[PDB]
Design an enzyme around this catalytic site. Structure first.
Site, PDB file in Angstrom:
ATOM      1  N   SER A  95      25.853  32.894 -18.788  1.00 23.92           N
ATOM      2  CA  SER A  95      24.982  32.474 -17.703  1.00 23.92           C
ATOM      3  C   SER A  95      23.730  31.841 -18.288  1.00 23.92           C
ATOM      4  CB  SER A  95      24.611  33.650 -16.794  1.00 23.92           C
ATOM      5  OG  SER A  95      23.647  33.264 -15.829  1.00 23.92           O
ATOM      6  N   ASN A 105      22.691  43.775 -14.943  1.00 20.06           N
ATOM      7  CA  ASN A 105      23.069  43.795 -13.529  1.00 20.06           C
ATOM      8  C   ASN A 105      23.668  42.435 -13.179  1.00 20.06           C
ATOM      9  OD1 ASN A 105      21.502  46.479 -12.726  1.00 20.06           O
ATOM     10  ND2 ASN A 105      20.074  45.174 -13.865  1.00 20.06           N
ATOM     11  N   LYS A 107      26.282  40.328 -10.712  1.00 20.35           N
ATOM     12  CA  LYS A 107      26.784  40.449  -9.352  1.00 20.35           C
ATOM     13  C   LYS A 107      27.767  39.324  -9.065  1.00 20.35           C
ATOM     14  CE  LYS A 107      22.473  42.580  -7.803  1.00 20.35           C
ATOM     15  NZ  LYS A 107      21.237  42.415  -6.988  1.00 20.35           N
ATOM     16  N   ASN A 122      29.031  28.859  -9.234  1.00 18.22           N
ATOM     17  CA  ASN A 122      30.122  28.106  -9.836  1.00 18.22           C
ATOM     18  C   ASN A 122      31.429  28.219  -9.064  1.00 18.22           C
ATOM     19  OD1 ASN A 122      28.250  27.544 -11.844  1.00 18.22           O
ATOM     20  ND2 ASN A 122      29.018  29.143 -13.219  1.00 18.22           N
ATOM     21  N   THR A 123      31.581  29.237  -8.221  1.00 17.86           N
ATOM     22  CA  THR A 123      32.726  29.291  -7.326  1.00 17.86           C
ATOM     23  C   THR A 123      32.568  28.257  -6.217  1.00 17.86           C
ATOM     24  OG1 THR A 123      31.618  31.133  -6.213  1.00 17.86           O
ATOM     25  CG2 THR A 123      33.388  31.672  -7.760  1.00 17.86           C
ATOM     26  N   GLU A 276      41.356  36.186 -18.419  1.00 16.92           N
ATOM     27  CA  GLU A 276      40.235  36.323 -17.503  1.00 16.92           C
ATOM     28  C   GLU A 276      40.271  37.714 -16.894  1.00 16.92           C
ATOM     29  OE1 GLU A 276      39.044  32.942 -14.975  1.00 16.92           O
ATOM     30  OE2 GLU A 276      39.241  34.311 -13.269  1.00 16.92           O
TER      31      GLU A 276
HETATM   32  N1  LIG Z   1      30.815  33.217 -16.318  1.00 19.84           N
HETATM   33  C1  LIG Z   1      31.967  33.197 -17.201  1.00 19.84           C
HETATM   34  O1  LIG Z   1      31.828  33.425 -18.356  1.00 19.84           O
HETATM   35  C2  LIG Z   1      33.359  32.871 -16.656  1.00 19.84           C
HETATM   36  C3  LIG Z   1      34.485  33.385 -17.276  1.00 19.84           C
HETATM   37  C4  LIG Z   1      35.723  33.061 -16.749  1.00 19.84           C
HETATM   38  C5  LIG Z   1      35.797  32.239 -15.636  1.00 19.84           C
HETATM   39  N2  LIG Z   1      34.707  31.772 -15.049  1.00 19.84           N
HETATM   40  C6  LIG Z   1      34.787  30.911 -13.899  1.00 19.84           C
HETATM   41  O2  LIG Z   1      33.606  30.766 -13.407  1.00 19.84           O
HETATM   42  C7  LIG Z   1      33.765  30.786 -11.867  1.00 19.84           C
HETATM   43  C8  LIG Z   1      32.699  31.455 -11.303  1.00 19.84           C
HETATM   44  O3  LIG Z   1      31.599  31.316 -12.157  1.00 19.84           O
HETATM   45  P1  LIG Z   1      30.735  32.653 -12.576  1.00 19.84           P
HETATM   46  O4  LIG Z   1      31.595  33.557 -13.426  1.00 19.84           O
HETATM   47  O5  LIG Z   1      29.519  32.239 -13.368  1.00 19.84           O
HETATM   48  O6  LIG Z   1      30.266  33.458 -11.214  1.00 19.84           O
HETATM   49  P2  LIG Z   1      29.556  32.739  -9.912  1.00 19.84           P
HETATM   50  O7  LIG Z   1      30.594  32.475  -8.848  1.00 19.84           O
HETATM   51  O8  LIG Z   1      28.920  31.437 -10.336  1.00 19.84           O
HETATM   52  O9  LIG Z   1      28.396  33.740  -9.308  1.00 19.84           O
HETATM   53  C9  LIG Z   1      27.698  34.556 -10.203  1.00 19.84           C
HETATM   54  C10 LIG Z   1      26.596  33.731 -10.838  1.00 19.84           C
HETATM   55  O10 LIG Z   1      25.141  34.363 -10.486  1.00 19.84           O
HETATM   56  C11 LIG Z   1      24.654  34.860 -11.555  1.00 19.84           C
HETATM   57  N3  LIG Z   1      24.134  36.232 -11.299  1.00 19.84           N
HETATM   58  C12 LIG Z   1      24.783  37.371 -11.479  1.00 19.84           C
HETATM   59  N4  LIG Z   1      23.998  38.386 -11.146  1.00 19.84           N
HETATM   60  C13 LIG Z   1      22.815  37.896 -10.740  1.00 19.84           C
HETATM   61  C14 LIG Z   1      21.605  38.441 -10.275  1.00 19.84           C
HETATM   62  N5  LIG Z   1      21.457  39.880 -10.151  1.00 19.84           N
HETATM   63  N6  LIG Z   1      20.596  37.647  -9.946  1.00 19.84           N
HETATM   64  C15 LIG Z   1      20.729  36.332 -10.057  1.00 19.84           C
HETATM   65  N7  LIG Z   1      21.849  35.778 -10.492  1.00 19.84           N
HETATM   66  C16 LIG Z   1      22.907  36.526 -10.838  1.00 19.84           C
HETATM   67  C17 LIG Z   1      25.827  34.898 -12.575  1.00 19.84           C
HETATM   68  O11 LIG Z   1      25.361  34.671 -13.833  1.00 19.84           O
HETATM   69  C18 LIG Z   1      26.721  33.758 -12.133  1.00 19.84           C
HETATM   70  O12 LIG Z   1      26.240  32.454 -12.719  1.00 19.84           O
HETATM   71  C19 LIG Z   1      35.098  31.572 -11.609  1.00 19.84           C
HETATM   72  O13 LIG Z   1      35.806  30.991 -10.419  1.00 19.84           O
HETATM   73  C20 LIG Z   1      35.804  31.418 -12.656  1.00 19.84           C
HETATM   74  F1  LIG Z   1      36.486  32.630 -12.944  1.00 19.84           F
HETATM   75  C21 LIG Z   1      33.511  32.061 -15.540  1.00 19.84           C
END
Ligand SMILES: NC(=O)c1ccc[n+]([C@@H]2O[C@H](COP(=O)([O-])OP(=O)(O)OC[C@H]3O[C@@H](n4cnc5c(N)ncnc54)[C@H](O)[C@@H]3O)[C@@H](O)[C@@H]2F)c1
Lengths: 424, 237, 138
Positions: A95, A105, A107, A122-123, A276
């Site tokens: 991240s 922490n 989430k 990123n989803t 994964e």
């Molecule tokens: N991250 C990494 O490494 C990975 C591995 C494998 C795969 N991947 C991809 O990527 C995508 C998603 O991305 P991610 O894992 O980064 O998760 P997201 O949806 O974007 O959401 C969560 C976010 O937010 C933050 N966070 C957590 N916790 C927290 C607090 N407590 N505050 C603020 N911020 C945060 C983290 O770092 C991420 O960027 C899925 O669909 C796929 F499975 C990634």
């Protein structure tokens, strides 16, 4: 023994949370409906442990499959399986945000969207509808039985997810494992591999064979799902299947080396597969390792709402111009208001931002266009209109020439912004 | 290459397209990109595609007018307004870069779902055909599209066209890219390398060769409705 | 009790097909089934064969030893009733918070919150452990 009952309650509640996450996934997943691994929707608000049960059942299914495919096991295959079963895993989450404060922490996307916490997402919409794994925290898998520097791999599916890598060494009692990304079951070609040199210099044919769709017996969309008890067995069996299918005898001899080192084993695993791991809801712990892989950029620090990197980088008002432009372009209204509080912006600052070709957004769009594109920046627009920084009815000159902020507001359908522009 | 430009003009004077002198030359280019839709997933990362295409076109002395997030009726009106521009009568070519979610019939508007809102690919050719648009008659008209997921009259009225469509079913479902789109990235890359020693059609074929990677092999940019009677040579200055 | 046996996992390391595995692969077969036994625990149970092979009837009796049966439903209910003096069938979030924070395994404060929110469906601050356990077990 009152503590034992407290531990019982704690384990029960953790199991409940995991059941909720897995029920969400299995019920709201359409690919689960195509196959017959779909689950009922909970009539009550919560879900019973059936979801968890389903997970276990689903796991066995895939295990069964691969067992029946490779049950006659050679001595080399048996030794490699024994190696894999006794191997422990490091789980890595990358991240550009600061998720650690002596307590890690992390989430999931669902919990973040719930509390309306500001961070990068990123989803995407298609992952949520087709898989509904957005109540799970995602990790990449590495071999942990080594003395080398801990971030062995940095890209999952040829994607770098941040400079701050958080590593844990303990398995989750209710997490599930997939040989690839649950949504993208395609192993990318070696052209994008992080450690291509090893396989290119030492192996020959496996380079072409590795790019494939890791699927089950039902078809391409069948993504094998395993639970924490069956992770290692399924991974080993699928690795044996791939090694048996391959024709590069050098690759097979390297994999079947009885005294293979753990770094080479991790190379083979993260090359043939892209494992994964998924943990339900949120991961909160004191046992973690943080590794700063590289330096973060200003725009990446803004998208992740990394206030400390922003405070380190924004030292002068030209950097404040750059940061405000990046904040507007990424709908980071919180960072924008923080910047407007730290520094005073005037019409001259807006003009110098309009003259800012180093920034992508200011080179493409006008300041007014960026202010009026999405409703998420409404307050900023307010500050610009009420303090005199931007003139309403200014006709755009760069992009969508001749239009005004009222037109972008109409496009956004945000009633508040349209009303505010009509009143001013 | 300035000596080669003069050499290619005299060698093939009826085999290549004419070029306007840098003085009194007003070459215009239009970019139409839809990144945010009302009932469709947003095409994130288009900020890079628009940027990389605006720079490459401006490096070829093209005045880029960028229009963004237009419904289909607006895209049609923008294309008609781009054909009525008197600045094209002083030009030799034009470039059309339309980037949006696109079905096989054409590109989709922002409001588009049960309710249809699509700009038919054929409508673009009609706006710029040799009857409706005389200012660009006998002039090459390039059309580059980035989409996601009698009739002999057309043979004659549609002249001097070239399309290089990309129909990668990304739909933010492939969900595997680095700060932009592969098609635009490779297209700019090949234009940086092979545009000085090749004509426009070769550059496109060089882009299709780049997609020889196993997972990126079926991602071939499709050339469609080629109506060019001459070879279009773009010169680096 | 056992219904589905671990014969398939045992058979993978049965090299000769005679129905036996070497004692060195004992922990490997158990770990393949989710059970992680300590080296000390592996050796005291290896003493059952005093040859270096282990048969499935002997392995099957080993698995049931480290079964680690999950907490039964009534064991869950009794765990909640020891923190309810009034016998009303309710525990306040703060009472549940004081219990989990100051008793049992130490967890982070964010974990305790996610658990309390999971138990208080009503949001009224009160948690009915009877309805929840009956709701989770079904
Ligand atoms: N991250 C990494 O490494 C990975 C591995 C494998 C795969 N991947 C991809 O990527 C995508 C998603 O991305 P991610 O894992 O980064 O998760 P997201 O949806 O974007 O959401 C969560 C976010 O937010 C933050 N966070 C957590 N916790 C927290 C607090 N407590 N505050 C603020 N911020 C945060 C983290 O770092 C991420 O960027 C899925 O669909 C796929 F499975 C990634």
């Amino acid at each position: 023994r009152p503590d034992h009952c407290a531990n019982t309650v704690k384990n029960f509640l953790r199991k409940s949370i995991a059941a909720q996450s897995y029920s969400k996934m299995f019920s709201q997943g359409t690919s689960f409906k195509s196959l017959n691994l779909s689950l009922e929707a909970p009539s009550g608000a919560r879900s019973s442990f059936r979801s968890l049960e389903h997970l276990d059942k689903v796991s066995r299914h895939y295990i069964s499959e691969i067992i029946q495919k490779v049950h006659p096991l050679s001595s080399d295959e048996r030794h490699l399986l024994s190696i894999i079963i006794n191997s422990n895993f490091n789980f890595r989450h990358q991240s550009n945000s600061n998720l650690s404060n002596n307590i890690l922490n992390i989430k999931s996307f669902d919990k973040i969207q719930s509390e309306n916490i500001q961070t990068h997402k990123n989803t995407y919409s298609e992952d949520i509808k087709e898989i509904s794994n957005h109540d799970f925290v995602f990790f990449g898998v590495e071999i942990s039985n080594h003395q080398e520097k801990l971030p062995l791999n940095k890209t999952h599916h040829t994607v770098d997810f941040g400079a701050n890598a958080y590593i844990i060494d303990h398995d989750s009692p209710y997490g599930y494992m997939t040989l690839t990304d649950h949504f993208d079951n395609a192993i990318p070609p070696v052209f994008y591999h992080e450690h291509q040199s090893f396989f290119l210099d030492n192996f020959k044919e496996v380079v072409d064979e590795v790019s494939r769709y890791v699927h089950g017996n039902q078809g391409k969309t069948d993504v094998p799902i395993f639970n924490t008890k069956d992770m290692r067995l399924g991974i080993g069996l699928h690795l044996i299947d791939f090694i048996r299918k391959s024709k590069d005898q050098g690759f097979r001899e390297f994999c079947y080396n009885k005294n293979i080192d753990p770094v080479s084993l991790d190379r083979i695993i993260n090359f043939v597969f892209q494992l994964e791991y998924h943990i339900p809801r949120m991961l909160s712990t004191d046992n973690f390792k943080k590794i700063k892989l590289r330096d973060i950029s200003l725009e990446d620090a803004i998208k992740a709402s990394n206030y400390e990197e922003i405070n380190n980088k924004v030292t002068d008002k030209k950097m404040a111009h750059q940061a405000l432009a990046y904040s507007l372009g990424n709908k980071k209204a919180d960072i924008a208001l923080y910047l407007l509080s730290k520094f005073n912006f005037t019409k001259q600052d807006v003009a110098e931002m309009e003259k800012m070709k180093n920034n992508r957004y200011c080179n493409l769009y006008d300041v007014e266009y960026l202010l009026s594109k999405d409703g998420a920046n409404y307050k900023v627009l307010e500050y610009f209109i009420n303090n005199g920084l931007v003139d309403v009815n200014k006709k755009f000159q760069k992009v969508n020439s001749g239009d005004t902020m009222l037109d972008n507001a109409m496009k956004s359908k945000d009633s508040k912004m349209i009303d505010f522009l009509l009143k001013n | 290459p300035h000596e080669e430009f003069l050499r290619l003009c005299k060698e093939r004077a009826e085999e290549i397209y004419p070029i306007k002198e840098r003085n009194n030359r007003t070459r215009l280019a239009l970019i139409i990109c839809n990144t945010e839709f009302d009932h469709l997933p947003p095409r994130n990362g288009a900020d890079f595609d628009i940027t990389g295409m605006k720079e490459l076109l401006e490096g070829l002395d093209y005045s880029v007018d960028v229009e963004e997030n237009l419904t289909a009726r607006d895209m049609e009106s923008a294309l008609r307004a781009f054909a009525t521009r008197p600045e094209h009568k002083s030009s030799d070519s034009t470039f059309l870069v339309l980037m949006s979610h696109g079905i096989l019939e054409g590109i989709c508007g922002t409001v588009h779902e049960k309710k249809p809102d699509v700009l038919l690919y054929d409508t673009i050719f009609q706006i710029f055909n040799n009857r409706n648009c005389l200012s660009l008659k006998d002039k090459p008209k390039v059309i580059i599209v980035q989409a996601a997921r009698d009739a002999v009259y057309k043979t004659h009225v549609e002249k001097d066209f070239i399309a290089f469509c990309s129909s990668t079913p990304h739909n933010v479902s492939w969900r595997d890219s680095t700060m932009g789109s592969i098609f635009i990235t490779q297209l700019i890359t090949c234009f940086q390398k092979y545009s000085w020693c090749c004509h426009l059609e070769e550059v496109f074929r060089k882009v299709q060769q780049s997609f020889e990677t196993p997972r990126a092999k079926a991602q071939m940019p499709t050339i469609e409705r080629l109506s060019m009677t001459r070879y279009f040579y773009l010169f680096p200055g | 009790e056992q219904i589905a046996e671990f014969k398939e996992a045992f058979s993978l390391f049965d090299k000769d097909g005679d129905g036996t595995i070497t004692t060195k692969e004992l922990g490997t077969v158990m770990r393949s089934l989710g059970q992680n036994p300590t080296e000390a625990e592996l050796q005291d149970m290896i003493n059952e064969v005093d040859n270096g092979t282990i048969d499935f009837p002997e392995f099957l009796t080993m698995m049931a030893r480290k079964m680690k049966d999950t907490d039964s439903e009534e064991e869950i209910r009794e765990a909640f009733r020891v923190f309810d003096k009034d016998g009303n069938g309710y525990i306040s979030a703060a009472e549940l918070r004081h219990v989990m924070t100051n008793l049992g395994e130490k967890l982070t404060d964010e974990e305790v919150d996610e658990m309390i929110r999971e138990a208080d469906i009503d949001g009224d601050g009160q948690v009915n452990y009877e309805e929840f356990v009956q709701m989770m077990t079904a």
